């Protein structure tokens, strides 16, 4: 349950799962209607960004390494983040 | 085939009030569709329930 | 029973409440009066009670 | 996830196949599958009409099965509308099912109690019922028949009391069909029920489609003292 | 024996402590069933004879028969110096009630009485028994002489101490209600660490109860 | 809890809760439930 | 059943209030409400499919022992021992004849319990209680 | 069944009976409409005791019809039935609906659903009665009946009887 959560990826609803068993691990994003699928490689991770709980705007961002690749992750529940 | 799946209570089916024709099918995840008789259903319909704080 | 938008429910119960009131008192301040087919106001029970030709 | 959640889901499914029709089954299965749903999402999933969901939402609100949430959010185009959200309160739902089944069995036990009373009498002209007590005062000078007061016609025997075995068969045929509900409530009482809400039921949401007009983020307000 | 089992099963359904003499129990027996003391006084003998004469290959399922025959004979033959304790919570930490019965021997001199009756010359000896006259009180027997010896030393071979307070002079106690006191447990840990720093070869450490070690070593390991 | 100010607007009662105003129409069934929850001594003091 | 009635079929979950009322004649568990319903108007048969013995309302009692055959033995030895009142002093200290009498009364309890020689033992019981 | 009670009765004394001797007129007019009179408040009142002295108050002249209104307090024996009561009696009439048993001044009806199933109706026999395999219940026959329900109007009392209970019926 800690590795699973519904998310938003470029204004598109989806889910987030951790492909932890394979080395390297992956953050797989799956569209709920089967439009597109996205995965995140864990080797190119530098900084990881979060919003505070007091803020109503709810956003998660990932900073990569070599023009870094920045991905948006909007969630629904706070315990999920 | 949808009719026999309905009478076996394996799928959930939507039919018109005009006639018994299927368009949309769902899966019967729970128990049997016809498990309570009509008289028991209607006297379940007759009975009411108390308000919030009583329970 | 048949399901309705909420404002239909408040509209219907307000109509019922108004009919109860004008049955019980047709002369209400700030309120319209129920009228007969001839257009005369409906003689409520309070009208039959109070007044010169009232009950008392 | 939680086994108790599976037990209450199975209980809600069993009662909706039992005491409800197919469309109520579809609505409750949509609620138990997608934990938090709105009106537009339900219309998209079920292809149901407003005049068709009206009886459905009215019945599951009258039977206290679906908790409704009155929340208005602000879309970026500033066309804010009062959207409604449908979720379930597990302890309230199981208490409602408990009270309904208890009052059902109490009513049918009272029916079995009152059907042991004798047949009584009834006048076919006036169509008025008579118990055993007032049949004696309607007895004539011939000491044979019971003459009606208004119709002046002899009374006939009502067909009540011979259905006492029919009521017993109805009682047993109801109770062998309710035993899984009894077992589910026993398993619930042997466990603990966590009282959820909209913010808690949003933890286990399943998205109906990609593009839902109704947002699932709660907007707090200051100064509301409801 | 089956109605013995059912009578005792009936006797467990109670919500409070039952503390009655064997005489009261047998009177309740004789008024609830029709079963006398004398047939119960041959219960174990009859059951053993029946099991022998049946020549059963396995006796795994008949051990509770030994239990009930033992109970019947014990509570029938004995009426003074004994008591029956029926209590509903065999452990008070259990969520579900588990009723218990305890048939106890109030008089400890009973089991030692035929030993004194049969034999003449008896030596009672412990390395650490005190007081010497305590035991002729708990056991109905008369000694011919009791004396305690003071063992003499060229140099004092043993050094006994009493510690009443920790390093911070906080009084230490091992009452079961204050077993979770962080100050007392911390003082205990401090003295045992210092002793382990200063003890050459080996220690034995004694506490009152098993749950006491469980809680207190859970706390020091934490 | 915060008891709102009640005023009549025709044949219905509206209650304005204070702002830390939250104004809404009070349903008759709600008032009936509240009046049922009023104890005997409470309306006895009120003259009922 | 173990928890719930056979006629009204009320569990202890939903109706914890009725009591373990059992026949001393046909030995069937039934709730208190079924006794107050069926047998208040008059005596009737056993309400199940298979037993139909005529039983009274006032003959119903609570169940002390949860077993049925044991309770049957209990009630028949109350029904027998009330007239079978012979002690050691009644035998004037004769142990052998007292033991034989105890064996005899135990045997007739067994015969009424299994219901095999019920007629002859019942006849002997009535002839003994008449004297 | 039979009780004794201290009752107060309100009597309309007509002005035509304002003779010198109203006491025995008042006692007499007490004594027609009480003896055998049925009241649901106290049952069938049968006989008035203590006739020599009866408490007679000072009478009310009603302001419209001039009649004297006396609140006479008297002591009398009454027959007030109840439900759950078993009594003896004799059958005075019978029918397919059931039979009427006379208990005192009262005709308690036993309905056709309230005998044991052994009894059945035979209208061919004269008189038409209820016959069973072990006993017959005819007119003017001794029978013990239990009353399960009594309805009491302002001036009439009717009762429901049965013989389904054990140790009932003919003695
Ligand atoms: Zn009529
Ligand atoms: Zn029952
Ligand atoms: Zn039976």
UniProtKB/Swiss-Prot annotation, chain C:
Subcellular location: Nucleus
Region (Rudder loop): 26-43
Annotated signal peptide: none
Residues forming coiled coils: none
Highest rank taxon of the organism: Eukaryota
Free-text function comment from the UniProt entry: DNA-dependent RNA polymerase catalyzes the transcription of DNA into RNA using the four ribonucleoside triphosphates as substrates. Largest and catalytic component of RNA polymerase II which synthesizes mRNA precursors and many functional non-coding RNAs. Forms the polymerase active center together with the second largest subunit. Pol II is the central component of the basal RNA polymerase II transcription machinery. During a transcription cycle, Pol II, general transcription factors and the Mediator complex assemble as the preinitiation complex (PIC) at the promoter.
Similarity-based family: Belongs to the RNA polymerase beta' chain family.
Subunit field text: Component of the RNA polymerase II (Pol II) complex consisting of 12 subunits. Interacts with DEF1; the interaction is direct and serves to bridge RPB1 to the Elongin complex in a DNA-damaged dependent manner. Interacts with the Elongin subunit ELA1. Interacts with the Elongin subunit ELC1. Interacts with ASK10. Interacts with ESS1. Interacts with RTT103. Interacts with SHE2.
Protein name: DNA-directed RNA polymerase II subunit RPB1
UniProtKB/Swiss-Prot annotation, chain D:
Cysteines joined through disulfide linkages: none
Subcellular location: Nucleus
Domain HTH TFE/IIEalpha-type: 8-98
Zinc finger (C4-type): 123-151
Domain of life: Eukaryota
Recorded family membership: Belongs to the TFIIE alpha subunit family.
Subunit structure: TFIIE is a tetramer of two alpha (TFA1) and two beta (TFA2) subunits.
General function of this protein: Recruits TFIIH to the initiation complex and stimulates the RNA polymerase II C-terminal domain kinase and DNA-dependent ATPase activities of TFIIH. Both TFIIH and TFIIE are required for promoter clearance by RNA polymerase.
Other information: Present with 35900 molecules/cell in log phase SD medium.
Protein name, as recorded: Transcription initiation factor IIE subunit alpha
Gene from which this protein is expressed: TFA1
Curated annotation (Swiss-Prot), chain E:
Note: Present with 14400 molecules/cell in log phase SD medium.
UniProt keywords, alphabetically: 4Fe-4S, ATP-binding, DNA damage, DNA repair, DNA-binding, Helicase, Hydrolase, Iron, Iron-sulfur, Isomerase, Metal-binding, Nucleotide-binding, Nucleus, Transcription, Transcription regulation
Gene Ontology terms describing biological process: nucleotide-excision repair; positive regulation of mitotic recombination; regulation of mitotic recombination; transcription by RNA polymerase II; transcription initiation at RNA polymerase II promoter
Listed name of the protein: General transcription and DNA repair factor IIH helicase subunit XPD/RAD3
Family membership: Belongs to the helicase family. RAD3/XPD subfamily.
GO function term, MF aspect, one: damaged DNA binding
Job description of the protein: ATP-dependent 5'-3' DNA helicase. Component of the general transcription and DNA repair factor IIH (TFIIH) core complex, which is involved in general and transcription-coupled nucleotide excision repair (NER) of damaged DNA and, when complexed to TFIIK, in RNA transcription by RNA polymerase II. In NER, TFIIH acts by opening DNA around the lesion to allow the excision of the damaged oligonucleotide and its replacement by a new DNA fragment. The ATP-dependent helicase activity of XPD/RAD3 is required for DNA opening. In transcription, TFIIH has an essential role in transcription initiation.
Top-level lineage group: Eukaryota
Keyword check for Transcription: yes
Subcellular location: Nucleus
Disruption phenotype: Essential, it cannot be deleted.
From Swiss-Prot, chain G:
Keyword Magnesium included in the entry's annotation: no
Major location (coarse): nucleus
Zinc finger motifs (RING-type), residue ranges: 5-52
The keyword Phosphoprotein is assigned to this record: yes
Any GO BP: DNA repair
Keywords assigned: Metal-binding, Nucleus, Phosphoprotein, Transcription, Transcription regulation, Zinc, Zinc-finger
GO molecular function, one term: cyclin-dependent protein serine/threonine kinase activator activity
Compartments (UniProt record): Nucleus
Superkingdom field: Eukaryota
GO cellular component annotations of the record: transcription factor TFIIH holo complex; transcription factor TFIIK complex
Free-text function comment from the UniProt entry: Acts as a component of the general transcription and DNA repair factor IIH (TFIIH or factor B), which is essential for both basal and activated transcription, and is involved in nucleotide excision repair (NER) of damaged DNA. TFIIH has CTD kinase and DNA-dependent ATPase activity, and is essential for polymerase II transcription in vitro.
Subunit note: Component of the transcription factor IIH (TFIIH) holo but not the TFIIH core complex. Component of a complex consisting of KIN28, CCL1 and TFB3; the KIN28-CCL1 dimer is known as the TFIIK complex.
Additional observations: Present with 3050 molecules/cell in log phase SD medium.
Protein name in the entry: RNA polymerase II transcription factor B subunit 3
Gene name in the database record: TFB3
